[PDB]
Amino acid sequence: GSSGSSGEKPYSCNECGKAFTFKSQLIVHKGVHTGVKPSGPSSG
Ligand SMILES: [Zn+2]
């Protein structure tokens, strides 16, 4: 369980909190928050 050390990442989450080297990587992790259902955009 070696997880923690982090250098520098211009992409970090705000909802739950996290870091990412590339945007895409962050977009995927963000999907867990935004729209927690396949039922398209909850609101709009
Ligand atoms: Zn997050």
Side-chain angles (χ1 to χ4, degrees):
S2 56
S3 67
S5 73
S6 181
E8 299 205 285
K9 275 154 188 180
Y11 304 85
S12 45
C13 176
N14 210 112
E15 324 208 36
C16 78
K18 189 152 175 83
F20 297 94
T21 311
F22 280 102
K23 169 159 270 210
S24 61
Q25 303 183 277
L26 173 61
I27 314 311
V28 182
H29 155 90
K30 279 199 183 287
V32 318
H33 318 300
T34 181
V36 297
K37 271 191 275 284
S39 311
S42 60
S43 290

mmCIF file of all heavy atoms in Angstrom:
data_model
loop_
_atom_site.group_PDB
_atom_site.id
_atom_site.type_symbol
_atom_site.label_atom_id
_atom_site.label_comp_id
_atom_site.label_asym_id
_atom_site.label_seq_id
_atom_site.Cartn_x
_atom_site.Cartn_y
_atom_site.Cartn_z
ATOM 1 N N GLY A 1 0.807 -1.206 0.000
ATOM 2 C CA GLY A 1 0.000 0.000 0.000
ATOM 3 C C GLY A 1 0.843 1.260 0.000
ATOM 4 O O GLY A 1 0.748 2.078 0.916
ATOM 5 N N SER A 2 1.671 1.417 -1.027
ATOM 6 C CA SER A 2 2.538 2.584 -1.139
ATOM 7 C C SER A 2 1.880 3.670 -1.985
ATOM 8 O O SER A 2 1.973 3.658 -3.213
ATOM 9 C CB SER A 2 3.883 2.189 -1.752
ATOM 10 O OG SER A 2 3.705 1.546 -3.002
ATOM 11 N N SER A 3 1.215 4.609 -1.318
ATOM 12 C CA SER A 3 0.538 5.701 -2.007
ATOM 13 C C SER A 3 0.559 6.972 -1.164
ATOM 14 O O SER A 3 0.203 6.955 0.013
ATOM 15 C CB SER A 3 -0.907 5.312 -2.327
ATOM 16 O OG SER A 3 -1.671 5.167 -1.143
ATOM 17 N N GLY A 4 0.981 8.074 -1.776
ATOM 18 C CA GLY A 4 1.043 9.339 -1.067
ATOM 19 C C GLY A 4 1.990 10.325 -1.720
ATOM 20 O O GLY A 4 1.590 11.426 -2.096
ATOM 21 N N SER A 5 3.252 9.929 -1.855
ATOM 22 C CA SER A 5 4.262 10.788 -2.463
ATOM 23 C C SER A 5 3.779 11.329 -3.806
ATOM 24 O O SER A 5 3.395 10.566 -4.692
ATOM 25 C CB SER A 5 5.571 10.019 -2.651
ATOM 26 O OG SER A 5 5.462 9.076 -3.704
ATOM 27 N N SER A 6 3.802 12.650 -3.947
ATOM 28 C CA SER A 6 3.363 13.294 -5.180
ATOM 29 C C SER A 6 4.240 14.499 -5.505
ATOM 30 O O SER A 6 4.436 15.382 -4.671
ATOM 31 C CB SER A 6 1.901 13.730 -5.060
ATOM 32 O OG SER A 6 1.448 14.332 -6.259
ATOM 33 N N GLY A 7 4.766 14.528 -6.725
ATOM 34 C CA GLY A 7 5.617 15.628 -7.141
ATOM 35 C C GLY A 7 4.827 16.878 -7.473
ATOM 36 O O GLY A 7 4.511 17.672 -6.587
ATOM 37 N N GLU A 8 4.510 17.055 -8.751
ATOM 38 C CA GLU A 8 3.753 18.219 -9.196
ATOM 39 C C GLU A 8 2.741 17.834 -10.269
ATOM 40 O O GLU A 8 3.073 17.140 -11.232
ATOM 41 C CB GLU A 8 4.701 19.294 -9.734
ATOM 42 C CG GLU A 8 5.693 19.804 -8.703
ATOM 43 C CD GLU A 8 6.178 21.209 -9.004
ATOM 44 O OE1 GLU A 8 7.005 21.366 -9.926
ATOM 45 O OE2 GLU A 8 5.729 22.150 -8.318
ATOM 46 N N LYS A 9 1.504 18.287 -10.099
ATOM 47 C CA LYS A 9 0.442 17.992 -11.052
ATOM 48 C C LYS A 9 -0.464 19.203 -11.252
ATOM 49 O O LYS A 9 -1.164 19.642 -10.340
ATOM 50 C CB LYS A 9 -0.386 16.797 -10.571
ATOM 51 C CG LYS A 9 0.207 15.452 -10.952
ATOM 52 C CD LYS A 9 -0.223 14.359 -9.988
ATOM 53 C CE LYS A 9 0.522 13.059 -10.250
ATOM 54 N NZ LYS A 9 0.111 11.984 -9.305
ATOM 55 N N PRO A 10 -0.451 19.757 -12.473
ATOM 56 C CA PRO A 10 -1.266 20.924 -12.822
ATOM 57 C C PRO A 10 -2.755 20.595 -12.878
ATOM 58 O O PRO A 10 -3.574 21.441 -13.237
ATOM 59 C CB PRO A 10 -0.752 21.315 -14.209
ATOM 60 C CG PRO A 10 -0.196 20.055 -14.777
ATOM 61 C CD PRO A 10 0.360 19.286 -13.609
ATOM 62 N N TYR A 11 -3.097 19.363 -12.521
ATOM 63 C CA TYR A 11 -4.488 18.922 -12.534
ATOM 64 C C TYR A 11 -4.850 18.225 -11.226
ATOM 65 O O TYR A 11 -4.379 17.123 -10.945
ATOM 66 C CB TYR A 11 -4.735 17.979 -13.713
ATOM 67 C CG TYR A 11 -4.380 18.579 -15.053
ATOM 68 C CD1 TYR A 11 -3.079 18.526 -15.540
ATOM 69 C CD2 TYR A 11 -5.346 19.201 -15.836
ATOM 70 C CE1 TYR A 11 -2.751 19.074 -16.764
ATOM 71 C CE2 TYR A 11 -5.026 19.750 -17.062
ATOM 72 C CZ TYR A 11 -3.728 19.685 -17.521
ATOM 73 O OH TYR A 11 -3.405 20.231 -18.743
ATOM 74 N N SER A 12 -5.690 18.877 -10.429
ATOM 75 C CA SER A 12 -6.115 18.323 -9.149
ATOM 76 C C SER A 12 -7.624 18.462 -8.969
ATOM 77 O O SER A 12 -8.229 19.429 -9.435
ATOM 78 C CB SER A 12 -5.387 19.024 -8.000
ATOM 79 O OG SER A 12 -5.384 20.429 -8.179
ATOM 80 N N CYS A 13 -8.225 17.492 -8.291
ATOM 81 C CA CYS A 13 -9.663 17.503 -8.049
ATOM 82 C C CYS A 13 -10.014 18.452 -6.906
ATOM 83 O O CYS A 13 -9.168 18.779 -6.075
ATOM 84 C CB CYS A 13 -10.159 16.092 -7.727
ATOM 85 S SG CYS A 13 -11.926 16.007 -7.292
ATOM 86 N N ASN A 14 -11.269 18.888 -6.872
ATOM 87 C CA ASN A 14 -11.733 19.799 -5.832
ATOM 88 C C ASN A 14 -12.882 19.181 -5.040
ATOM 89 O O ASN A 14 -13.005 19.396 -3.835
ATOM 90 C CB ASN A 14 -12.180 21.125 -6.448
ATOM 91 C CG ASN A 14 -11.981 22.298 -5.507
ATOM 92 O OD1 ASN A 14 -11.149 23.171 -5.752
ATOM 93 N ND2 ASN A 14 -12.745 22.320 -4.422
ATOM 94 N N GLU A 15 -13.720 18.411 -5.727
ATOM 95 C CA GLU A 15 -14.859 17.762 -5.088
ATOM 96 C C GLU A 15 -14.403 16.887 -3.924
ATOM 97 O O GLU A 15 -14.684 17.185 -2.763
ATOM 98 C CB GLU A 15 -15.628 16.916 -6.105
ATOM 99 C CG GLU A 15 -15.673 17.526 -7.496
ATOM 100 C CD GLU A 15 -16.910 17.118 -8.272
ATOM 101 O OE1 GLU A 15 -17.986 16.993 -7.650
ATOM 102 O OE2 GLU A 15 -16.802 16.923 -9.501
ATOM 103 N N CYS A 16 -13.698 15.807 -4.242
ATOM 104 C CA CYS A 16 -13.204 14.888 -3.224
ATOM 105 C C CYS A 16 -11.741 15.174 -2.898
ATOM 106 O O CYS A 16 -11.313 15.042 -1.752
ATOM 107 C CB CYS A 16 -13.357 13.441 -3.697
ATOM 108 S SG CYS A 16 -12.081 12.905 -4.882
ATOM 109 N N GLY A 17 -10.979 15.569 -3.914
ATOM 110 C CA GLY A 17 -9.573 15.868 -3.714
ATOM 111 C C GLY A 17 -8.665 14.821 -4.327
ATOM 112 O O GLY A 17 -8.710 13.649 -3.952
ATOM 113 N N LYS A 18 -7.836 15.243 -5.278
ATOM 114 C CA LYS A 18 -6.913 14.334 -5.946
ATOM 115 C C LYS A 18 -5.982 15.097 -6.885
ATOM 116 O O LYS A 18 -6.158 16.294 -7.109
ATOM 117 C CB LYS A 18 -7.688 13.273 -6.731
ATOM 118 C CG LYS A 18 -6.812 12.156 -7.273
ATOM 119 C CD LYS A 18 -7.585 10.856 -7.407
ATOM 120 C CE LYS A 18 -6.744 9.771 -8.062
ATOM 121 N NZ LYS A 18 -5.859 9.086 -7.080
ATOM 122 N N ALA A 19 -4.995 14.395 -7.431
ATOM 123 C CA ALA A 19 -4.040 15.006 -8.347
ATOM 124 C C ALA A 19 -3.898 14.183 -9.622
ATOM 125 O O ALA A 19 -4.195 12.988 -9.638
ATOM 126 C CB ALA A 19 -2.687 15.168 -7.669
ATOM 127 N N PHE A 20 -3.445 14.828 -10.691
ATOM 128 C CA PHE A 20 -3.267 14.156 -11.973
ATOM 129 C C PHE A 20 -2.277 14.914 -12.852
ATOM 130 O O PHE A 20 -2.266 16.146 -12.877
ATOM 131 C CB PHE A 20 -4.610 14.023 -12.694
ATOM 132 C CG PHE A 20 -5.609 13.182 -11.951
ATOM 133 C CD1 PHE A 20 -6.525 13.770 -11.094
ATOM 134 C CD2 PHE A 20 -5.632 11.806 -12.110
ATOM 135 C CE1 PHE A 20 -7.446 13.000 -10.409
ATOM 136 C CE2 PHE A 20 -6.550 11.032 -11.427
ATOM 137 C CZ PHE A 20 -7.458 11.629 -10.575
ATOM 138 N N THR A 21 -1.445 14.170 -13.574
ATOM 139 C CA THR A 21 -0.450 14.770 -14.453
ATOM 140 C C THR A 21 -1.095 15.317 -15.721
ATOM 141 O O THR A 21 -0.720 16.383 -16.210
ATOM 142 C CB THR A 21 0.641 13.754 -14.844
ATOM 143 O OG1 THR A 21 1.133 13.091 -13.674
ATOM 144 C CG2 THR A 21 1.791 14.445 -15.563
ATOM 145 N N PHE A 22 -2.068 14.583 -16.249
ATOM 146 C CA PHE A 22 -2.767 14.995 -17.461
ATOM 147 C C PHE A 22 -4.234 15.293 -17.169
ATOM 148 O O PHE A 22 -4.811 14.763 -16.218
ATOM 149 C CB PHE A 22 -2.658 13.908 -18.532
ATOM 150 C CG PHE A 22 -1.347 13.916 -19.265
ATOM 151 C CD1 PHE A 22 -0.363 12.990 -18.960
ATOM 152 C CD2 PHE A 22 -1.101 14.850 -20.259
ATOM 153 C CE1 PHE A 22 0.845 12.997 -19.633
ATOM 154 C CE2 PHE A 22 0.105 14.861 -20.936
ATOM 155 C CZ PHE A 22 1.079 13.932 -20.622
ATOM 156 N N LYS A 23 -4.834 16.145 -17.992
ATOM 157 C CA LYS A 23 -6.235 16.514 -17.824
ATOM 158 C C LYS A 23 -7.135 15.286 -17.907
ATOM 159 O O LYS A 23 -7.875 14.984 -16.972
ATOM 160 C CB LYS A 23 -6.646 17.534 -18.890
ATOM 161 C CG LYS A 23 -8.144 17.775 -18.955
ATOM 162 C CD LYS A 23 -8.466 19.102 -19.621
ATOM 163 C CE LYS A 23 -8.539 20.232 -18.604
ATOM 164 N NZ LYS A 23 -9.489 21.298 -19.027
ATOM 165 N N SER A 24 -7.066 14.582 -19.033
ATOM 166 C CA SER A 24 -7.877 13.388 -19.238
ATOM 167 C C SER A 24 -7.955 12.558 -17.960
ATOM 168 O O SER A 24 -9.043 12.249 -17.475
ATOM 169 C CB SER A 24 -7.298 12.542 -20.374
ATOM 170 O OG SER A 24 -5.980 12.116 -20.073
ATOM 171 N N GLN A 25 -6.794 12.200 -17.422
ATOM 172 C CA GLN A 25 -6.730 11.406 -16.201
ATOM 173 C C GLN A 25 -7.640 11.989 -15.125
ATOM 174 O O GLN A 25 -8.259 11.253 -14.354
ATOM 175 C CB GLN A 25 -5.291 11.336 -15.687
ATOM 176 C CG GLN A 25 -4.309 10.775 -16.701
ATOM 177 C CD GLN A 25 -2.903 10.656 -16.149
ATOM 178 O OE1 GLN A 25 -2.145 11.626 -16.135
ATOM 179 N NE2 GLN A 25 -2.545 9.463 -15.689
ATOM 180 N N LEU A 26 -7.716 13.315 -15.075
ATOM 181 C CA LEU A 26 -8.549 13.997 -14.092
ATOM 182 C C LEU A 26 -10.022 13.923 -14.482
ATOM 183 O O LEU A 26 -10.895 13.786 -13.625
ATOM 184 C CB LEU A 26 -8.119 15.459 -13.956
ATOM 185 C CG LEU A 26 -9.010 16.343 -13.083
ATOM 186 C CD1 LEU A 26 -9.048 15.818 -11.656
ATOM 187 C CD2 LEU A 26 -8.524 17.784 -13.111
ATOM 188 N N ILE A 27 -10.290 14.014 -15.780
ATOM 189 C CA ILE A 27 -11.656 13.954 -16.283
ATOM 190 C C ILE A 27 -12.322 12.634 -15.913
ATOM 191 O O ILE A 27 -13.502 12.596 -15.565
ATOM 192 C CB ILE A 27 -11.701 14.126 -17.813
ATOM 193 C CG1 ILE A 27 -10.816 15.299 -18.243
ATOM 194 C CG2 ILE A 27 -13.133 14.337 -18.281
ATOM 195 C CD1 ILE A 27 -11.054 16.559 -17.441
ATOM 196 N N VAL A 28 -11.555 11.550 -15.988
ATOM 197 C CA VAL A 28 -12.070 10.226 -15.657
ATOM 198 C C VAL A 28 -12.399 10.119 -14.173
ATOM 199 O O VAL A 28 -13.458 9.617 -13.795
ATOM 200 C CB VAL A 28 -11.060 9.123 -16.027
ATOM 201 C CG1 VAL A 28 -11.633 7.748 -15.721
ATOM 202 C CG2 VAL A 28 -10.668 9.231 -17.493
ATOM 203 N N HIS A 29 -11.485 10.595 -13.333
ATOM 204 C CA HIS A 29 -11.679 10.556 -11.887
ATOM 205 C C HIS A 29 -12.812 11.486 -11.466
ATOM 206 O O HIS A 29 -13.456 11.270 -10.439
ATOM 207 C CB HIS A 29 -10.388 10.946 -11.167
ATOM 208 C CG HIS A 29 -10.613 11.505 -9.796
ATOM 209 N ND1 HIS A 29 -10.649 10.723 -8.661
ATOM 210 C CD2 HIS A 29 -10.811 12.778 -9.381
ATOM 211 C CE1 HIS A 29 -10.863 11.491 -7.607
ATOM 212 N NE2 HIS A 29 -10.964 12.742 -8.017
ATOM 213 N N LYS A 30 -13.050 12.520 -12.265
ATOM 214 C CA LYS A 30 -14.107 13.484 -11.976
ATOM 215 C C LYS A 30 -15.477 12.903 -12.304
ATOM 216 O O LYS A 30 -16.478 13.259 -11.684
ATOM 217 C CB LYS A 30 -13.882 14.771 -12.771
ATOM 218 C CG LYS A 30 -12.856 15.701 -12.146
ATOM 219 C CD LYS A 30 -12.987 17.118 -12.680
ATOM 220 C CE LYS A 30 -11.917 18.032 -12.105
ATOM 221 N NZ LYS A 30 -12.180 18.364 -10.678
ATOM 222 N N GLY A 31 -15.516 12.005 -13.285
ATOM 223 C CA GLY A 31 -16.770 11.390 -13.678
ATOM 224 C C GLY A 31 -17.501 10.764 -12.507
ATOM 225 O O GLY A 31 -18.728 10.662 -12.514
ATOM 226 N N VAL A 32 -16.746 10.341 -11.498
ATOM 227 C CA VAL A 32 -17.329 9.722 -10.314
ATOM 228 C C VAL A 32 -18.236 10.697 -9.572
ATOM 229 O O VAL A 32 -19.198 10.294 -8.919
ATOM 230 C CB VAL A 32 -16.239 9.217 -9.350
ATOM 231 C CG1 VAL A 32 -15.116 8.540 -10.120
ATOM 232 C CG2 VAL A 32 -15.702 10.364 -8.506
ATOM 233 N N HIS A 33 -17.922 11.985 -9.679
ATOM 234 C CA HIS A 33 -18.709 13.021 -9.019
ATOM 235 C C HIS A 33 -19.816 13.531 -9.938
ATOM 236 O O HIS A 33 -21.002 13.388 -9.640
ATOM 237 C CB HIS A 33 -17.810 14.181 -8.592
ATOM 238 C CG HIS A 33 -16.507 13.741 -7.998
ATOM 239 N ND1 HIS A 33 -16.423 12.950 -6.872
ATOM 240 C CD2 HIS A 33 -15.232 13.985 -8.383
ATOM 241 C CE1 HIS A 33 -15.151 12.728 -6.588
ATOM 242 N NE2 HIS A 33 -14.408 13.344 -7.490
ATOM 243 N N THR A 34 -19.419 14.127 -11.059
ATOM 244 C CA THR A 34 -20.377 14.661 -12.020
ATOM 245 C C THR A 34 -21.248 13.552 -12.601
ATOM 246 O O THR A 34 -20.740 12.562 -13.127
ATOM 247 C CB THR A 34 -19.665 15.396 -13.171
ATOM 248 O OG1 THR A 34 -20.632 15.926 -14.085
ATOM 249 C CG2 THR A 34 -18.722 14.459 -13.911
ATOM 250 N N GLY A 35 -22.562 13.726 -12.504
ATOM 251 C CA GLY A 35 -23.482 12.732 -13.025
ATOM 252 C C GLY A 35 -23.172 11.336 -12.523
ATOM 253 O O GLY A 35 -22.463 10.575 -13.181
ATOM 254 N N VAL A 36 -23.705 10.997 -11.353
ATOM 255 C CA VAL A 36 -23.482 9.683 -10.764
ATOM 256 C C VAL A 36 -24.453 8.653 -11.331
ATOM 257 O O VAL A 36 -24.673 7.598 -10.737
ATOM 258 C CB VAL A 36 -23.630 9.723 -9.230
ATOM 259 C CG1 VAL A 36 -22.578 10.633 -8.615
ATOM 260 C CG2 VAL A 36 -25.030 10.175 -8.844
ATOM 261 N N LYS A 37 -25.032 8.968 -12.485
ATOM 262 C CA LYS A 37 -25.979 8.070 -13.135
ATOM 263 C C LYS A 37 -25.917 8.220 -14.652
ATOM 264 O O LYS A 37 -25.723 9.314 -15.184
ATOM 265 C CB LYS A 37 -27.400 8.350 -12.642
ATOM 266 C CG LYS A 37 -27.780 7.559 -11.402
ATOM 267 C CD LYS A 37 -29.267 7.670 -11.105
ATOM 268 C CE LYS A 37 -29.582 8.919 -10.296
ATOM 269 N NZ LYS A 37 -29.190 8.768 -8.867
ATOM 270 N N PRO A 38 -26.087 7.098 -15.366
ATOM 271 C CA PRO A 38 -26.057 7.080 -16.832
ATOM 272 C C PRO A 38 -27.271 7.771 -17.445
ATOM 273 O O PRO A 38 -27.390 7.868 -18.667
ATOM 274 C CB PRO A 38 -26.066 5.586 -17.168
ATOM 275 C CG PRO A 38 -26.715 4.938 -15.995
ATOM 276 C CD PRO A 38 -26.324 5.760 -14.798
ATOM 277 N N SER A 39 -28.168 8.250 -16.590
ATOM 278 C CA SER A 39 -29.374 8.929 -17.048
ATOM 279 C C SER A 39 -29.055 10.348 -17.511
ATOM 280 O O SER A 39 -29.640 11.317 -17.028
ATOM 281 C CB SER A 39 -30.419 8.968 -15.932
ATOM 282 O OG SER A 39 -30.596 7.686 -15.354
ATOM 283 N N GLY A 40 -28.124 10.462 -18.452
ATOM 284 C CA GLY A 40 -27.743 11.764 -18.966
ATOM 285 C C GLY A 40 -27.577 12.795 -17.867
ATOM 286 O O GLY A 40 -27.364 12.462 -16.701
ATOM 287 N N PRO A 41 -27.674 14.080 -18.236
ATOM 288 C CA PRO A 41 -27.534 15.190 -17.287
ATOM 289 C C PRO A 41 -28.712 15.276 -16.321
ATOM 290 O O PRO A 41 -29.814 15.669 -16.705
ATOM 291 C CB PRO A 41 -27.491 16.425 -18.190
ATOM 292 C CG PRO A 41 -28.212 16.016 -19.428
ATOM 293 C CD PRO A 41 -27.926 14.551 -19.609
ATOM 294 N N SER A 42 -28.471 14.908 -15.067
ATOM 295 C CA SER A 42 -29.513 14.942 -14.047
ATOM 296 C C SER A 42 -30.397 16.174 -14.215
ATOM 297 O O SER A 42 -31.619 16.067 -14.306
ATOM 298 C CB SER A 42 -28.888 14.933 -12.650
ATOM 299 O OG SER A 42 -28.048 16.058 -12.461
ATOM 300 N N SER A 43 -29.768 17.345 -14.252
ATOM 301 C CA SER A 43 -30.497 18.599 -14.403
ATOM 302 C C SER A 43 -30.104 19.302 -15.699
ATOM 303 O O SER A 43 -29.131 18.926 -16.353
ATOM 304 C CB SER A 43 -30.228 19.517 -13.210
ATOM 305 O OG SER A 43 -30.848 19.022 -12.036
ATOM 306 N N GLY A 44 -30.869 20.326 -16.066
ATOM 307 C CA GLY A 44 -30.587 21.066 -17.281
ATOM 308 C C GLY A 44 -31.844 21.411 -18.056
ATOM 309 O O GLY A 44 -31.918 22.499 -18.624
HETATM 310 ZN ZN ZN B 1 -12.437 13.798 -6.968
#
